[PDB]
Amino acid sequence: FSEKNAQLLAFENDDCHLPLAMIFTLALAYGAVIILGVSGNLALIIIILKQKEMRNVTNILIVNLSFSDLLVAIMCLPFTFVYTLMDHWVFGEAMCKLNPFVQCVSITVSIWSLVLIAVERHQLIINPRGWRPNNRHAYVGIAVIWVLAVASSLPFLIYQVMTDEPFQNVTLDAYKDKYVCFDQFPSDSHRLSYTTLLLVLQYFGPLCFIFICYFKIYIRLKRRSETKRINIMLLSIVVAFAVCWLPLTIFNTVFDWNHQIIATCNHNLLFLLCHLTAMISTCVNPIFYGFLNKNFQRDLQFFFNFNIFEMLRIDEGLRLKIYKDTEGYYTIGIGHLLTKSPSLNAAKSELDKAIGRNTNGVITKDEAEKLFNQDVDAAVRGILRNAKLKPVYDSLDAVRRAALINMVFQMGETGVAGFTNSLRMLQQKRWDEAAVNSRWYNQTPNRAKRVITTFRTGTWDAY
Ligand SMILES: CCC(=O)NCCNC(=O)/N=C(/N)NCCC[C@@H](NC(=O)C(c1ccccc1)c1ccccc1)C(=O)NCc1ccc(O)cc1
Secondary structure, X not given: OOOOHHHOOEEOOOOOOXXXXXXXXXXXXXXXHHHHHHHHHHXXXXXXXXXXXOOOHHHHHHHHHHHHHHHHHHHOHHHHHHHHHHOOOOOOXXXXXXXXXXXXXXXXXXXXXXXXXXXXHHHHHOOOOOOOOOHHHHHHHHHHHHHHHHHHHHHHHHHEEEEOHHHOOOOOXXXXXXXXXXXXXXXXXXXXXXXXXXXXXHHHHHHHHHHHHHHHHHHHHHHOOOOHHHHHHHHHHHHHHHHHHHHHHHHHHHHHHOXXXXXXXXXXXXXXXXXXXXXXXXHHHHHHHHOOOHHHHHHHHHHOOOXXXXXXXXXXXXXXXXXXXXXXXXXXXXXXXXXXXXXXXXXXXXXXXXXXXXXXXXXXHHHHHHHHHHHHHHHHHHHHHXXXXXXXXXXXXXXXXXXXXXXXXXXXXXXXXXXXXXXXXXXXXXXXXXXXXXXXXXXXXXXXXXXXXXHHOOOOOOO
């Protein structure tokens, strides 16, 4: 019973006529991505390997990614292109089976590397106390990724067939003896289950996890090492991969679910445009690393012109031992007042209660950060209970919210609400009119201007 022959795609729009101009344009485009892919990745592989850095996890995974993109450029990319133009497979059955297998292996190898890099960067910012990413851990990761990528791509090597059966329906009576390189899965269910597996496990799934990682990193930094340029580059590499693959993912998925569609001409041109777009991702990564260099950027910008914790550690400082403030009251950490009493034993008692240990007038930076976390949490709940503070805070962004929290750390919940004039203008987004509008600038001019600039601009110019 030929149930396998019914799992082969049907094509019937022999009237495929593209102007030589468009074909030549595609040959130059594919030619450009083939050279940029082979040249850019080889350069990236050699540059990372020759630059010996004792502990670099991210770049080892970028070599992994660029080596798989180097494989596609040699083994897949030229073969897939001429095959679509000629409209018959002139290579071996080996190349026929290798073409979708090697491409599928490479998609999984690239995205699961990007998954590990997102984890690596998540562990460096969210949990720096653990600092788990090591080179040995990456070497196991790459070996797991390749072994699993191959195993999960084998149905392409197994069921992709070099066949001439689809040629029976399109006349072909009777001179050509031509072959097409088509997938021939065991059933409709086998195809749909496997294609869904690939879509969920290699595209929608991994990208969801990565975007959650970079968003958890984004939100942490706003509440809270010049590797910011790196994190923006790595994010723009995932966005690049996802955006280049999206049209091909949509195209292929439509054909996986509606396998009874007669593949026309228009579908051949549509596939080429989609495929070429997906091939752009195999050469963008080295162009990101090249444009990362600070000197080259300085040349570029000259030719073409185109956080609460850190804010308060500057404005109030960080102390691990009990000290007297400007008023003489016993403080600790980031402006944390213990008592307004003259007693030192009372302060040490209040400190021992807050921490839950016999501190003996001394704490660690972790106990100092937690005490500050407790302070800002108590400061934010007080802002919400206040009728003048709750509406202005809600309208304010994370940068200007940090400046309003900085203010409550200096005066208090009642002191800040005393600025009836300025609070109204900050609520109405009139920042410059509010910045010009107290004894606060008279007592400390340096600190007051540092927070006024953040209320006016909405960035960290002063810090
Ligand atoms: C695409 C990204 C993704 O993550 N997709 C998850 C879900 N589905 C999925 O991957 N499906 C398939 N069928 N992969 C092999 C595509 C081979 C080929 N496409 C076709 O012949 C399709 C076709 C149809 C009409 C005209 C021209 C081309 C076609 C699609 C479906 C059935 C039959 C023919 C092609 O795009 N080759 C490059 C390639 C190879 C492996 C791979 O995993 C991704 C990309």
